[PDB]
Amino acid sequence: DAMIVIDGHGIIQLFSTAAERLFGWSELEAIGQNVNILMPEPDRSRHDSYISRYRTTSDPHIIGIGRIVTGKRRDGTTFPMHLSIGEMQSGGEPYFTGFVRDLTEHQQTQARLQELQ
Ligand code: HEM
């Protein structure tokens, strides 16, 4: 699916091809940007505190659990996606890997089945 790797400050280190297709940002444009550029407010402005909080408490809210959330594309459209987060270490510092599964199709079918009674 789409895969993204960020350092402990939420900065995008790696951005896969599939992620480019999904979020609308090329790898070059993405790397160097905070991961918060991939979601809408209120998560966006709160994203750093989510990471800081985790690093301070070591009490996960998504790592090892998963969560369906709303991501944001370059053109500004929002969409539902399942997010899985793995934690890694490299060069003495933490890195996090996010696996994104686009759930738009699932949401759409579900809504269509509901509107037709
Ligand atoms: C792009 C859509 C995304 C949204 C909507 C989102 C949202 C969130 C939310 C709501 C939390 C937990 C806050 C709480 O419950 O207190 C969180 C935690 C975090 N997010 Fe994101 N996130 C996104 C993508 C990512 C990606 C791509 C990564 C990794 C590449 C990532 C890394 C983290 C980390 C490391 C934490 C803390 C982990 C934990 O609490 O267990 N996020 N995010």
From Swiss-Prot:
<feature type="domain" description="PAC 2">
    <location>
        <begin position="56"/>
        <end position="115"/>
    </location>
</feature>
<protein>
    <recommendedName>
        <fullName>Sensor protein FixL</fullName>
    </recommendedName>
</protein>
<feature type="binding site" description="axial binding residue">
    <location>
        <position position="47"/>
    </location>
    <ligand>
        <name>heme</name>
    </ligand>
</feature>
<feature type="domain" description="PAS 2">
    <location>
        <begin position="1"/>
        <end position="55"/>
    </location>
</feature>
<comment type="function">
    <text>Putative oxygen sensor; modulates the activity of FixJ, a transcriptional activator of nitrogen fixation fixK gene. FixL probably acts as a kinase that phosphorylates FixJ.</text>
</comment>
